[PDB]
mmCIF file of N, CA and C in Angstrom:
data_model
loop_
_atom_site.group_PDB
_atom_site.id
_atom_site.type_symbol
_atom_site.label_atom_id
_atom_site.label_comp_id
_atom_site.label_asym_id
_atom_site.label_seq_id
_atom_site.Cartn_x
_atom_site.Cartn_y
_atom_site.Cartn_z
ATOM 1 N N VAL A 1 -9.625 -2.601 -6.067
ATOM 2 C CA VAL A 1 -10.994 -2.927 -5.642
ATOM 3 C C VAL A 1 -11.834 -3.567 -6.757
ATOM 4 N N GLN A 2 -12.821 -4.327 -6.285
ATOM 5 C CA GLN A 2 -13.892 -4.906 -7.120
ATOM 6 C C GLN A 2 -14.982 -3.865 -7.399
ATOM 7 N N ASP A 3 -15.298 -3.158 -6.311
ATOM 8 C CA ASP A 3 -16.280 -2.054 -6.203
ATOM 9 C C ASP A 3 -16.193 -1.425 -4.811
ATOM 10 N N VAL A 4 -15.813 -0.151 -4.803
ATOM 11 C CA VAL A 4 -15.708 0.586 -3.521
ATOM 12 C C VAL A 4 -17.078 1.108 -3.097
ATOM 13 N N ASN A 5 -17.349 0.847 -1.825
ATOM 14 C CA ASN A 5 -18.526 1.312 -1.087
ATOM 15 C C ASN A 5 -18.075 1.780 0.307
ATOM 16 N N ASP A 6 -19.023 2.162 1.156
ATOM 17 C CA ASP A 6 -18.704 2.661 2.520
ATOM 18 C C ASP A 6 -17.829 1.743 3.385
ATOM 19 N N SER A 7 -18.079 0.433 3.330
ATOM 20 C CA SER A 7 -17.291 -0.579 4.082
ATOM 21 C C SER A 7 -15.880 -0.702 3.512
ATOM 22 N N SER A 8 -15.798 -0.937 2.203
ATOM 23 C CA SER A 8 -14.504 -1.080 1.508
ATOM 24 C C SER A 8 -13.668 0.190 1.411
ATOM 25 N N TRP A 9 -14.295 1.350 1.584
ATOM 26 C CA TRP A 9 -13.606 2.657 1.572
ATOM 27 C C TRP A 9 -12.438 2.705 2.566
ATOM 28 N N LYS A 10 -12.737 2.361 3.808
ATOM 29 C CA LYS A 10 -11.697 2.372 4.871
ATOM 30 C C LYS A 10 -10.615 1.317 4.713
ATOM 31 N N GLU A 11 -11.041 0.205 4.135
ATOM 32 C CA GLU A 11 -10.251 -1.028 3.992
ATOM 33 C C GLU A 11 -9.314 -0.988 2.786
ATOM 34 N N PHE A 12 -9.844 -0.566 1.644
ATOM 35 C CA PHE A 12 -9.099 -0.494 0.375
ATOM 36 C C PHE A 12 -8.426 0.850 0.080
ATOM 37 N N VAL A 13 -9.215 1.886 0.284
ATOM 38 C CA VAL A 13 -8.854 3.281 -0.040
ATOM 39 C C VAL A 13 -7.986 3.865 1.071
ATOM 40 N N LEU A 14 -8.470 3.773 2.305
ATOM 41 C CA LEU A 14 -7.706 4.360 3.416
ATOM 42 C C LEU A 14 -6.618 3.431 3.971
ATOM 43 N N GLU A 15 -6.634 2.174 3.508
ATOM 44 C CA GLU A 15 -5.663 1.169 3.981
ATOM 45 C C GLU A 15 -4.953 0.377 2.871
ATOM 46 N N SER A 16 -4.251 1.125 2.012
ATOM 47 C CA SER A 16 -3.428 0.562 0.926
ATOM 48 C C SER A 16 -1.930 0.730 1.150
ATOM 49 N N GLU A 17 -1.622 1.635 2.086
ATOM 50 C CA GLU A 17 -0.274 2.104 2.493
ATOM 51 C C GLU A 17 0.381 3.067 1.483
ATOM 52 N N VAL A 18 -0.264 3.158 0.327
ATOM 53 C CA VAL A 18 0.269 3.795 -0.887
ATOM 54 C C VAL A 18 -0.683 4.916 -1.372
ATOM 55 N N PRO A 19 -0.200 5.927 -2.115
ATOM 56 C CA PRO A 19 -1.059 6.936 -2.761
ATOM 57 C C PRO A 19 -2.254 6.290 -3.469
ATOM 58 N N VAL A 20 -3.414 6.887 -3.211
ATOM 59 C CA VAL A 20 -4.721 6.345 -3.624
ATOM 60 C C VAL A 20 -5.514 7.321 -4.490
ATOM 61 N N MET A 21 -6.185 6.716 -5.470
ATOM 62 C CA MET A 21 -7.117 7.426 -6.354
ATOM 63 C C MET A 21 -8.419 6.668 -6.639
ATOM 64 N N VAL A 22 -9.495 7.444 -6.576
ATOM 65 C CA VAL A 22 -10.869 6.909 -6.646
ATOM 66 C C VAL A 22 -11.763 7.538 -7.724
ATOM 67 N N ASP A 23 -12.137 6.722 -8.691
ATOM 68 C CA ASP A 23 -13.074 7.121 -9.767
ATOM 69 C C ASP A 23 -14.514 6.955 -9.264
ATOM 70 N N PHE A 24 -15.266 8.037 -9.269
ATOM 71 C CA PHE A 24 -16.703 7.986 -8.896
ATOM 72 C C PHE A 24 -17.553 7.821 -10.153
ATOM 73 N N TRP A 25 -18.123 6.635 -10.266
ATOM 74 C CA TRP A 25 -18.966 6.278 -11.417
ATOM 75 C C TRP A 25 -20.418 6.047 -10.960
ATOM 76 N N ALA A 26 -21.326 6.147 -11.925
ATOM 77 C CA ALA A 26 -22.769 6.080 -11.644
ATOM 78 C C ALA A 26 -23.463 5.144 -12.643
ATOM 79 N N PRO A 27 -24.404 4.310 -12.196
ATOM 80 C CA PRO A 27 -25.137 3.372 -13.077
ATOM 81 C C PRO A 27 -25.814 4.085 -14.252
ATOM 82 N N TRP A 28 -26.358 5.262 -13.953
ATOM 83 C CA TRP A 28 -26.952 6.182 -14.949
ATOM 84 C C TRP A 28 -25.954 6.822 -15.941
ATOM 85 N N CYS A 29 -24.664 6.747 -15.615
ATOM 86 C CA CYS A 29 -23.558 7.092 -16.543
ATOM 87 C C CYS A 29 -23.337 5.954 -17.566
ATOM 88 N N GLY A 30 -23.866 4.768 -17.247
ATOM 89 C CA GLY A 30 -23.682 3.524 -18.004
ATOM 90 C C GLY A 30 -22.770 2.558 -17.230
ATOM 91 N N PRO A 31 -22.015 1.698 -17.927
ATOM 92 C CA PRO A 31 -21.089 0.732 -17.278
ATOM 93 C C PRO A 31 -19.731 1.387 -16.952
ATOM 94 N N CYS A 32 -19.824 2.585 -16.390
ATOM 95 C CA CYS A 32 -18.705 3.503 -16.122
ATOM 96 C C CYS A 32 -17.561 3.015 -15.223
ATOM 97 N N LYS A 33 -17.835 1.917 -14.530
ATOM 98 C CA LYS A 33 -16.876 1.215 -13.682
ATOM 99 C C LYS A 33 -15.678 0.687 -14.505
ATOM 100 N N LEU A 34 -15.989 -0.020 -15.592
ATOM 101 C CA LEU A 34 -14.975 -0.586 -16.497
ATOM 102 C C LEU A 34 -14.440 0.397 -17.552
ATOM 103 N N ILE A 35 -14.849 1.650 -17.415
ATOM 104 C CA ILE A 35 -14.412 2.741 -18.316
ATOM 105 C C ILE A 35 -13.262 3.491 -17.621
ATOM 106 N N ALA A 36 -13.542 4.043 -16.432
ATOM 107 C CA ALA A 36 -12.598 4.805 -15.576
ATOM 108 C C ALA A 36 -11.464 5.451 -16.390
ATOM 109 N N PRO A 37 -11.803 6.332 -17.342
ATOM 110 C CA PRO A 37 -10.885 6.729 -18.430
ATOM 111 C C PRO A 37 -9.471 7.170 -18.014
ATOM 112 N N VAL A 38 -9.323 8.422 -17.594
ATOM 113 C CA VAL A 38 -8.020 8.958 -17.138
ATOM 114 C C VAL A 38 -7.431 8.121 -15.987
ATOM 115 N N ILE A 39 -8.291 7.612 -15.110
ATOM 116 C CA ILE A 39 -7.911 6.779 -13.946
ATOM 117 C C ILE A 39 -7.270 5.455 -14.373
ATOM 118 N N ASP A 40 -7.802 4.896 -15.458
ATOM 119 C CA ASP A 40 -7.270 3.688 -16.111
ATOM 120 C C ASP A 40 -5.854 3.916 -16.655
ATOM 121 N N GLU A 41 -5.655 5.113 -17.182
ATOM 122 C CA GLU A 41 -4.338 5.560 -17.657
ATOM 123 C C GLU A 41 -3.336 5.878 -16.547
ATOM 124 N N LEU A 42 -3.814 6.529 -15.476
ATOM 125 C CA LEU A 42 -2.974 6.791 -14.293
ATOM 126 C C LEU A 42 -2.479 5.516 -13.601
ATOM 127 N N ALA A 43 -3.194 4.431 -13.870
ATOM 128 C CA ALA A 43 -2.882 3.080 -13.390
ATOM 129 C C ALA A 43 -1.553 2.577 -13.983
ATOM 130 N N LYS A 44 -1.496 2.547 -15.314
ATOM 131 C CA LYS A 44 -0.276 2.189 -16.052
ATOM 132 C C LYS A 44 0.830 3.264 -16.005
ATOM 133 N N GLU A 45 0.414 4.514 -15.875
ATOM 134 C CA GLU A 45 1.342 5.654 -15.704
ATOM 135 C C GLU A 45 2.100 5.588 -14.369
ATOM 136 N N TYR A 46 1.353 5.294 -13.312
ATOM 137 C CA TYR A 46 1.893 5.192 -11.946
ATOM 138 C C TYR A 46 1.749 3.784 -11.342
ATOM 139 N N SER A 47 2.222 2.830 -12.133
ATOM 140 C CA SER A 47 2.271 1.402 -11.742
ATOM 141 C C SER A 47 3.145 1.179 -10.496
ATOM 142 N N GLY A 48 2.439 0.937 -9.395
ATOM 143 C CA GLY A 48 3.048 0.715 -8.068
ATOM 144 C C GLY A 48 2.791 1.908 -7.138
ATOM 145 N N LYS A 49 3.117 3.096 -7.668
ATOM 146 C CA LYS A 49 2.883 4.406 -7.036
ATOM 147 C C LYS A 49 1.489 4.543 -6.419
ATOM 148 N N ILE A 50 0.507 4.151 -7.211
ATOM 149 C CA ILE A 50 -0.900 4.301 -6.833
ATOM 150 C C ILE A 50 -1.757 3.042 -6.865
ATOM 151 N N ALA A 51 -2.732 3.167 -5.977
ATOM 152 C CA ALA A 51 -3.845 2.234 -5.807
ATOM 153 C C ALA A 51 -5.116 2.855 -6.411
ATOM 154 N N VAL A 52 -5.484 2.259 -7.529
ATOM 155 C CA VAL A 52 -6.596 2.650 -8.422
ATOM 156 C C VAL A 52 -7.909 1.923 -8.079
ATOM 157 N N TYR A 53 -8.876 2.745 -7.662
ATOM 158 C CA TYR A 53 -10.218 2.306 -7.235
ATOM 159 C C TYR A 53 -11.369 2.968 -8.018
ATOM 160 N N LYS A 54 -12.520 2.294 -7.992
ATOM 161 C CA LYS A 54 -13.772 2.765 -8.627
ATOM 162 C C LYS A 54 -15.009 2.576 -7.728
ATOM 163 N N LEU A 55 -15.495 3.729 -7.284
ATOM 164 C CA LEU A 55 -16.654 3.837 -6.370
ATOM 165 C C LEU A 55 -18.010 3.842 -7.075
ATOM 166 N N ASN A 56 -18.795 2.889 -6.601
ATOM 167 C CA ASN A 56 -20.202 2.689 -6.986
ATOM 168 C C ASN A 56 -21.041 3.676 -6.190
ATOM 169 N N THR A 57 -21.257 4.818 -6.816
ATOM 170 C CA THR A 57 -21.976 5.956 -6.195
ATOM 171 C C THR A 57 -23.332 5.601 -5.566
ATOM 172 N N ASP A 58 -24.123 4.843 -6.319
ATOM 173 C CA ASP A 58 -25.422 4.317 -5.846
ATOM 174 C C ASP A 58 -25.312 3.358 -4.646
ATOM 175 N N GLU A 59 -24.157 2.728 -4.532
ATOM 176 C CA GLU A 59 -23.838 1.784 -3.441
ATOM 177 C C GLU A 59 -23.238 2.476 -2.204
ATOM 178 N N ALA A 60 -22.754 3.698 -2.385
ATOM 179 C CA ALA A 60 -22.154 4.492 -1.296
ATOM 180 C C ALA A 60 -22.769 5.900 -1.133
ATOM 181 N N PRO A 61 -23.980 5.988 -0.546
ATOM 182 C CA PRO A 61 -24.663 7.283 -0.310
ATOM 183 C C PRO A 61 -24.198 8.004 0.979
ATOM 184 N N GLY A 62 -22.925 7.793 1.297
ATOM 185 C CA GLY A 62 -22.212 8.379 2.446
ATOM 186 C C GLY A 62 -20.865 8.953 1.998
ATOM 187 N N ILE A 63 -20.141 8.162 1.212
ATOM 188 C CA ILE A 63 -18.872 8.581 0.613
ATOM 189 C C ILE A 63 -19.070 9.766 -0.348
ATOM 190 N N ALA A 64 -19.899 9.541 -1.358
ATOM 191 C CA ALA A 64 -20.252 10.572 -2.348
ATOM 192 C C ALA A 64 -20.687 11.919 -1.733
ATOM 193 N N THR A 65 -21.450 11.794 -0.641
ATOM 194 C CA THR A 65 -21.933 12.895 0.216
ATOM 195 C C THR A 65 -20.738 13.638 0.841
ATOM 196 N N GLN A 66 -19.996 12.884 1.648
ATOM 197 C CA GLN A 66 -18.896 13.383 2.473
ATOM 198 C C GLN A 66 -17.830 14.156 1.668
ATOM 199 N N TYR A 67 -17.595 13.654 0.460
ATOM 200 C CA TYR A 67 -16.588 14.209 -0.462
ATOM 201 C C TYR A 67 -17.129 15.264 -1.436
ATOM 202 N N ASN A 68 -18.422 15.558 -1.316
ATOM 203 C CA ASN A 68 -19.136 16.580 -2.114
ATOM 204 C C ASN A 68 -19.032 16.367 -3.639
ATOM 205 N N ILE A 69 -19.272 15.118 -4.015
ATOM 206 C CA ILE A 69 -19.143 14.715 -5.434
ATOM 207 C C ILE A 69 -20.484 14.868 -6.133
ATOM 208 N N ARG A 70 -20.442 15.950 -6.891
ATOM 209 C CA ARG A 70 -21.585 16.448 -7.693
ATOM 210 C C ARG A 70 -21.504 16.048 -9.168
ATOM 211 N N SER A 71 -20.324 15.585 -9.573
ATOM 212 C CA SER A 71 -20.090 15.230 -10.984
ATOM 213 C C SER A 71 -19.623 13.791 -11.155
ATOM 214 N N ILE A 72 -20.102 13.199 -12.244
ATOM 215 C CA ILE A 72 -19.684 11.851 -12.652
ATOM 216 C C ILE A 72 -19.032 11.955 -14.054
ATOM 217 N N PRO A 73 -17.728 11.691 -14.115
ATOM 218 C CA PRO A 73 -16.861 11.317 -12.969
ATOM 219 C C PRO A 73 -16.284 12.482 -12.148
ATOM 220 N N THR A 74 -15.881 12.069 -10.953
ATOM 221 C CA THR A 74 -15.062 12.838 -9.992
ATOM 222 C C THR A 74 -14.002 11.883 -9.436
ATOM 223 N N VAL A 75 -12.833 12.448 -9.170
ATOM 224 C CA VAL A 75 -11.714 11.698 -8.580
ATOM 225 C C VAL A 75 -11.048 12.476 -7.431
ATOM 226 N N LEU A 76 -10.776 11.713 -6.390
ATOM 227 C CA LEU A 76 -10.063 12.186 -5.193
ATOM 228 C C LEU A 76 -8.736 11.450 -5.043
ATOM 229 N N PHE A 77 -7.747 12.236 -4.638
ATOM 230 C CA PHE A 77 -6.342 11.857 -4.494
ATOM 231 C C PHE A 77 -5.928 11.984 -3.041
ATOM 232 N N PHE A 78 -5.666 10.792 -2.550
ATOM 233 C CA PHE A 78 -5.218 10.446 -1.191
ATOM 234 C C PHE A 78 -3.780 9.948 -1.303
ATOM 235 N N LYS A 79 -3.090 10.056 -0.180
ATOM 236 C CA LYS A 79 -1.783 9.421 -0.059
ATOM 237 C C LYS A 79 -1.994 8.085 0.688
ATOM 238 N N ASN A 80 -1.698 8.110 1.976
ATOM 239 C CA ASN A 80 -1.828 6.949 2.864
ATOM 240 C C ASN A 80 -2.958 7.218 3.860
ATOM 241 N N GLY A 81 -4.154 7.013 3.308
ATOM 242 C CA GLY A 81 -5.429 7.322 3.962
ATOM 243 C C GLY A 81 -5.617 8.810 4.310
ATOM 244 N N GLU A 82 -5.048 9.677 3.485
ATOM 245 C CA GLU A 82 -5.027 11.132 3.739
ATOM 246 C C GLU A 82 -5.272 11.824 2.404
ATOM 247 N N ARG A 83 -6.239 12.719 2.400
ATOM 248 C CA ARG A 83 -6.719 13.340 1.158
ATOM 249 C C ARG A 83 -6.026 14.668 0.879
ATOM 250 N N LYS A 84 -5.638 14.782 -0.382
ATOM 251 C CA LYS A 84 -4.735 15.843 -0.872
ATOM 252 C C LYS A 84 -5.428 16.774 -1.874
ATOM 253 N N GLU A 85 -5.996 16.156 -2.915
ATOM 254 C CA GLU A 85 -6.550 16.853 -4.086
ATOM 255 C C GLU A 85 -7.840 16.213 -4.611
ATOM 256 N N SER A 86 -8.778 17.061 -5.020
ATOM 257 C CA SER A 86 -10.052 16.624 -5.620
ATOM 258 C C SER A 86 -10.353 17.277 -6.979
ATOM 259 N N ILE A 87 -10.315 16.443 -8.001
ATOM 260 C CA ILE A 87 -10.592 16.840 -9.398
ATOM 261 C C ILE A 87 -12.025 16.417 -9.756
ATOM 262 N N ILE A 88 -12.853 17.452 -9.690
ATOM 263 C CA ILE A 88 -14.253 17.428 -10.136
ATOM 264 C C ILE A 88 -14.254 17.348 -11.676
ATOM 265 N N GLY A 89 -15.077 16.428 -12.186
ATOM 266 C CA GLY A 89 -15.188 16.168 -13.641
ATOM 267 C C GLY A 89 -14.272 15.016 -14.069
ATOM 268 N N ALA A 90 -13.054 15.025 -13.523
ATOM 269 C CA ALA A 90 -12.000 14.005 -13.737
ATOM 270 C C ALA A 90 -11.660 13.695 -15.212
ATOM 271 N N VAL A 91 -11.648 14.770 -15.986
ATOM 272 C CA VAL A 91 -11.480 14.703 -17.450
ATOM 273 C C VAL A 91 -10.198 15.300 -18.102
ATOM 274 N N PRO A 92 -9.615 16.427 -17.645
ATOM 275 C CA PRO A 92 -8.358 16.934 -18.210
ATOM 276 C C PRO A 92 -7.188 16.120 -17.664
ATOM 277 N N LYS A 93 -6.806 15.187 -18.510
ATOM 278 C CA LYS A 93 -5.776 14.185 -18.223
ATOM 279 C C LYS A 93 -4.527 14.742 -17.515
ATOM 280 N N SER A 94 -4.029 15.845 -18.040
ATOM 281 C CA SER A 94 -2.838 16.545 -17.501
ATOM 282 C C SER A 94 -2.945 16.968 -16.041
ATOM 283 N N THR A 95 -4.087 17.525 -15.654
ATOM 284 C CA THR A 95 -4.398 17.946 -14.273
ATOM 285 C C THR A 95 -4.415 16.799 -13.254
ATOM 286 N N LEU A 96 -5.025 15.711 -13.690
ATOM 287 C CA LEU A 96 -5.067 14.433 -12.958
ATOM 288 C C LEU A 96 -3.665 13.850 -12.746
ATOM 289 N N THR A 97 -2.830 13.962 -13.773
ATOM 290 C CA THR A 97 -1.421 13.524 -13.688
ATOM 291 C C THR A 97 -0.622 14.404 -12.710
ATOM 292 N N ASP A 98 -0.790 15.701 -12.933
ATOM 293 C CA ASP A 98 -0.298 16.789 -12.063
ATOM 294 C C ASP A 98 -0.640 16.536 -10.586
ATOM 295 N N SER A 99 -1.861 16.054 -10.377
ATOM 296 C CA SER A 99 -2.410 15.752 -9.051
ATOM 297 C C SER A 99 -1.732 14.684 -8.213
ATOM 298 N N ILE A 100 -1.185 13.645 -8.841
ATOM 299 C CA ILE A 100 -0.415 12.628 -8.075
ATOM 300 C C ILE A 100 0.936 13.190 -7.649
ATOM 301 N N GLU A 101 1.637 13.628 -8.693
ATOM 302 C CA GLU A 101 3.044 14.046 -8.672
ATOM 303 C C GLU A 101 3.338 15.195 -7.687
ATOM 304 N N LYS A 102 2.277 15.960 -7.466
ATOM 305 C CA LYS A 102 2.092 17.011 -6.455
ATOM 306 C C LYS A 102 2.600 16.569 -5.060
ATOM 307 N N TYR A 103 2.080 15.436 -4.623
ATOM 308 C CA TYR A 103 2.379 14.779 -3.339
ATOM 309 C C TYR A 103 3.275 13.533 -3.454
ATOM 310 N N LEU A 104 3.074 12.767 -4.527
ATOM 311 C CA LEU A 104 3.890 11.586 -4.884
ATOM 312 C C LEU A 104 5.108 12.147 -5.631
#
């Protein structure tokens, strides 16, 4: 994705055919979109395995709501448009890695 919002959520996130992961970033966090720390690493770690996305929280006041994302960052782990695991904080690298391999 370029930037995930409510429209692109169904299209990119729920329609990749492949295990999906979404970094929730916030403008008040700074330029957190191009940071996506552990998520950026899970990209090269699971090259092909996963579809790596970054949600513009301010742009999606429905997604952030629905998924109960209280922390920036937060990451959710989907398979093929189906949600498996939610790592609030999205910071302990090992847990995030653990989270794909769980279902993938």
